[PDB]
């Protein structure tokens, strides 16, 4: 297999600056005359937009901002300069040799200043425990860095099964980021404990950020 | 100037063979050096070559599928296939086909597999906790569970209220997918006027409001 390690696997920019994304190959994609390898932007969605194709050529109305690189081994992508509608996932894929690899992509963030998230937490609603199901939603919006964990504790304890975490992407208007945890339980379970407790640590602090309820 | 189309079925069951169909015009199986590649990148992850076929019906196999895998050119009226055999939930995927595997990337063509059918959404309102006067806040949500198969079209006020929404993506549970989200608003907002998430699911003609009220 030509195995092709990308790197960095995120990448925070500000903008108008330039980036640069390396895809690393174990064997040459080259016909020791053309270099096979070639670069893909995806934004959440779209399908795979070719940018540049055998290491140099860009594609037509692909804007000449995007510089490709490179031979054998290494290769290089240089997005100069980073606009805002960048922000993507980029993917290099060699076609030298079969099977046909992909790196595993290097996602382009912008960059802004620290956020910690304003948690809430919500109890089922009445609705819910009237079907006998307990769901206990937990938002933890608008923040930055990406990194950050979920820890429910029930009644002391870290209970971590029928957890659901979800995320979106980067906010184009502050670019921040979101994410929903959600504790199910079943209301005889429910109805068995009183705190409910998501603690969202990270960065931004110092101790878990920790929103909890009593009954 | 090329036009490559894929055609497939919606939902799949597992046990199943996926039939694809790839629709070509703008070049000819016949060029030297000319190939069709089938390419799918699973739900939320990286794109994975299928298998690959050439101008002189040559035929190349991703090593771990091949077992379940065909691909044929109708060259008569310019289609080439990939047949999957015995489909389970693991190729939930969007197939591209891919003009001699990296230049010209037709539009996808998604195939979801499951056991599951066509069930109606629930939504559940879920109004604040609340620990008021650390801020002139306040967030609301609507959690959106249960419902098969995607999509769902959530607005809040009837698409009035779009500043400060955050609909997280939906993941499918058992079989099943949820979906949650939330706005958040100033004080003097909620509850002086009221609002209304509203949901719905066209795989069913569900179309419900849920009023956020006080607990």
């Known amino acids: 297999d030509i195995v092709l390690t990308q790197s960095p696997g995120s990448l925070a920019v500000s903008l108008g600056q330039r980036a640069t994304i390396s895809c690393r190959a174990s064997e040459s994609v080259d016909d020791d005359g053309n270099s096979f390898l070639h670069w893909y932007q995806q934004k959440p969605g779209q399908p795979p937009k070719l940018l540049i194709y055998?290491?140099?050529n860009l594609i037509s109305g692909i804007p000449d901002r995007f510089s490709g690189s490179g031979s054998r081994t290494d290769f290089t992508l240089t997005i100069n300069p980073v606009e805002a509608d960048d922000v993507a996932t980029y993917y290099c894929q060699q076609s030298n040799e079969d099977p046909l690899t992909f790196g595993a992509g290097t996602k382009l963030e912008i960059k802004r200043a620290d956020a910690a998230p304003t948690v809430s937490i919500f109890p089922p609603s009445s609705e819910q425990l009237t079907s006998g199901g307990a769901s206990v939603v937990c938002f933890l919006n608008n923040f930055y860095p990406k990194d950050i964990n979920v820890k429910w504790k029930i009644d002391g304890s870290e209970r971590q099964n029928g957890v659901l975490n979800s995320w979106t992407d980067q906010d184009s208007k502050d670019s921040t980021y979101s994410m929903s945890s959600t504790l199910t339980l079943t209301k005889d379970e429910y109805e068995r404990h009183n705190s409910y407790t998501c603690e969202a640590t990270h960065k931004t602090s110092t101790s878990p950020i920790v929103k909890s309820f009593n009954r | 100037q090329v036009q490559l189309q894929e055609s497939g079925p919606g939902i799949l069951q597992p046990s199943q063979t996926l039939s694809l169909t790839c629709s070509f015009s703008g070049f000819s199986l016949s060029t030297y050096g000319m190939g069709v590649s089938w390419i799918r990148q699973p739900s939320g992850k990286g794109l994975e070559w299928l298998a690959h076929?050439?101008?002189?019906?040559?035929?190349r196999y991703n090593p771990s599928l091949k077992s379940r895998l065909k691909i044929s050119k109708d060259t008569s009226n310019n289609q080439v296939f990939l047949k999957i055999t015995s489909v389970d939930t693991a190729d939930t995927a969007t197939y591209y086909c891919?003009?001699?595997?990296?230049?010209?990337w037709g539009q996808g063509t998604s195939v979801t597999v499951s056991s599951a059918k066509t069930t109606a959404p629930s939504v559940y309102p879920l109004a604040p906790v609340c620990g008021d006067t650390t801020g002139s806040s306040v967030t609301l949500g609507c959690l959106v569970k249960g419902y098969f198969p995607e999509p769902v079209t959530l607005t809040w006020n009837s698409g009035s209220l779009s500043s400060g929404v955050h609909t997280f993506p939906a993941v499918l549970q058992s079989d099943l997918y949820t979906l949650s989200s939330s706005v958040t608003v100033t004080s003097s907002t909620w509850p002086s006027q009221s609002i209304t998430c509203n949901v719905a699911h066209p795989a069913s003609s569900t179309k419900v409001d849920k009023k956020i009220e006080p607990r």
């Open positions: 076929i050439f101008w002189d019906g040559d035929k």
């Open positions: 055998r290491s140099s």
């Open positions: 891919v003009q001699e595997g990296y230049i010209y």
